[PDB]
């Protein structure tokens, strides 16, 4: 079968055949679409078909499908699976798997970069201190004095699910949040639960509005341990506005390196439960979501006050006015400090080019419109007008439950 | 199978049981989600009639009553005999209101029960259709205190006698391809503007020419009619801060009235059913004015604002966009024409959703269409999970008539 997607701004029509290689479920049925739902242990039984499929993909990409190396590798993985119940990826396969998990991430607007990913093999790690050292080197390499470089560090794969490697942080760099007795929140409200865990584990919290959280690292299913990222490795950007000199007095900053650390990387049926990856920000992640979500820092009111907008009626669009100015300030500050950032116009335009290229060279590009379209100015970016097919390919990044809900504490 | 939807801004969780009553299909499968795709006989009819009558008599608390069974019997006998059937006035009103209630892409549905239904099923000619449409337009406009309305022309019979309004909206601006290569007026309507000229219209070739009506009764050739200008309420667009904004020469019309959809009630098909409500500001300010394939005025507004259009990262488009949408709301409000900003309308829809989940067990909703095309995440609907499914009675798309008309 062939499926067509249409861009309703340009009338470009693209034909998807890649969806035929989709295995996992979407959550939708013929009778209900779960397209806007946020969130829609493995034996030798199912593992070799998952392995074989990945290895067929791998050897096809290197133009070696059917070769002796291909057949021998399948043979080697088969015996290793029956002998040991799992298998180990070659370095080349790990690199390929990690790049394609990013390439397959249908919610990621930044995938034009998928092939320039620095893969750090951390599968020889055994302890939380070792994890901290790998993560520090990741942070230093990826930050690169503001000239950000995409990187992923891959810790040992799951075995029996009782010895998991986990980074308990959702992101490697993230600000603490503190629930005050009066009900207000100091810092990032999205991080209150994790902040409280860190404090319980012995973190001495500064209790400021932009405290970089400690790393909480779990090696081999042991209880997690706390580590402070060297501050010299944490690049931060004070937020000022190019016209509004009072904007700096809001006291805002953000960190430069977005590094997701709580997802699971699936490659050939293997599960990498600790695989922190990082790229660079699209401005709206900070300016729109982090700063202006009602349940995040929520600065719209105070910004709109300082701008002296008509805040009595929503139809003055005072929220939309402030939102743009905040987002100008984020992009201005990062560029002024020469820290890599991309605005939503550039990023969406690149994604369209990437997506068209993928359809031509690959037969498709799974894309989740709900997530691709930026959270401001949606229809003046070209992704808004682009029809997209969402389906799940492997290798893939998957969600996993927060470890404090599953972890069996040693004491 | 009893599904939950979470609002991630408020953690409010709603349980959806209404989706199990869904009938038609979404276009999605377990292998592929098509959520962002724009457009995915006597034996067929009586189950459709029975399903609708069942929900109707349940809605009036007479399910399983003699009146229910008799009507089921009566319609059953009518389909057996005439191969179709006719809705009582009460069922037609209920069916139309519920087609709006079920429009999963409509953010305005909190108003669904206050719909004025104009029964036009006695209409036989395009002139008669014109008369019904002028009355609709005048009633709905109401001197700018807009009121929701639908006018329902006779139902499809053998598909050769279809009633169709060829316009996509009762009121829309013409589009002309210039010899110069550009487009004057609304580019979205260039093709329809051609068919009006091809059928005899005398185009003023302006930037905001109200298109004439192209009305088709009983499958005959469509006929041109000019809506009385005194019935077409328009709002000149000025900014409450930029005096130069008036010189852009922008106006829009007050009455959004979709005329090309198909209303399905109890298996019956109403191919001509223009309905109207009132605008959300962003439809005009974001889509009509700022889409690249439409009036596409961002450049000119940004220039007048003297924004730095050298780099996208100055967010000059975003700044201009906000101001254009401030002007649209300000202009409609100042002229006392009903309009709703995207903040109010999405807040109302959240309240509507909660109302529907409480009193109905669900609300089918299409996130891709419900979230406004600007400032998405600062509106509550962005953080609202939504289940999309197809309920009937429903509004449906249909082929453009010129592609089908046996001339
Ligand atoms: C290099 C620059 C990058 C940019 C500009 C970018 C942009 C984005 C944005 C804006 C989102 C939406 C996230 C949100 O709203 O919270 C996203 C999602 C995502 N990104 Fe990228 N990204 C980049 C790099 C990467 C890399 C290096 C990876 C992995 C190796 C990655 C994997 C993902 C995944 C898996 C998601 C979806 C998360 C989910 O499924 O919920 N991205 N990306
Ligand atoms: C009264 C105020 C109303 C408001 C503010 C409103 C708002 C909207 C908006 C913004 C859209 C997206 C349309 C687009 O972007 O082109 C929409 C879609 C829609 N509206 Fe409403 N609407 C209203 C009244 C009505 C009425 C009275 C009906 C029918 C009786 C209706 C039926 C629909 C349908 C069927 C769609 C989706 C069409 C599709 O499936 O693609 N609306 N509405
Ligand atoms: C690598 C990278 C680049 C970039 N531009 N931004 C980020 C942070 C955003 C982001 C992702 F991308 C991917 C995943 C998550 C976690 C999702 C959290 N959700 C469910 C509330 C994320 F929060 C990371
Ligand atoms: C009754 C009403 C209220 C309001 N606020 N706006 C409108 C016009 C938008 C609109 C709809 F709502 C419903 C349907 C269409 C047609 C769809 C056009 N698509 C496919 C480009 C529409 F274009 C109509
Ligand atoms: C309910 C809805 O699915 C949820 O709010 C989604 C919408 N789209 C998004 N898109 C991005 N990029 N990031 C998000 O967190 C979300 N949230
Ligand atoms: C491709 C995509 O489905 C298309 O651009 C949609 C997106 N969401 C929309 N939402 C609304 N309200 N109106 C639209 O026309 C569209 N267009
Ligand atoms: Zn779907």
UniProtKB/Swiss-Prot annotation, chain A:
Annotated function: Produces nitric oxide (NO) which is a messenger molecule with diverse functions throughout the body. In the brain and peripheral nervous system, NO displays many properties of a neurotransmitter. Inhibitory transmitter for non-adrenergic and non-cholinergic nerves in the colorectum. Probably has nitrosylase activity and mediates cysteine S-nitrosylation of cytoplasmic target proteins such SRR. Inhibitory transmitter for non-adrenergic and non-cholinergic nerves in the colorectum.
Residues annotated for (6R)-L-erythro-5,6,7,8-tetrahydrobiopterin binding in this entry: 36, 370-371, 384
Location of the protein in the cell: Cell membrane, Sarcolemma; Cell projection, Dendritic spine
Subunit structure and binding partners: Homodimer. Interacts with DLG4 (via N-terminal tandem pair of PDZ domains); the interaction possibly being prevented by the association between NOS1 and CAPON. Forms a ternary complex with CAPON and RASD1. Forms a ternary complex with CAPON and SYN1. Interacts with ZDHHC23. Interacts with NOSIP; which may impair its synaptic location. Interacts with HTR4. Interacts with SLC6A4. Interacts with VAC14.
Modified how: Ubiquitinated; mediated by STUB1/CHIP in the presence of Hsp70 and Hsp40 (in vitro).
Binding sites annotated in the UniProt record for heme b: 108, 399
Family under the similarity heading: Belongs to the NOS family.
List of residues binding L-arginine: 171, 280-281, 285
Protein name (record): Nitric oxide synthase 1
Tissue-specific expression: Isoform N-NOS-1 is expressed in brain and colorectum. Found in the Auerbach's plexus of the enteric nervous system. Isoform PNNOS is expressed in the penis, urethra, prostate, and skeletal muscle, and coexists with the cerebellar nnos in the pelvic plexus, bladder and liver, and is detectable in the cerebellum.
Domains as described in the record: The PDZ domain participates in protein-protein interaction, and is responsible for targeting nNos to synaptic membranes. Mediates interaction with VAC14.
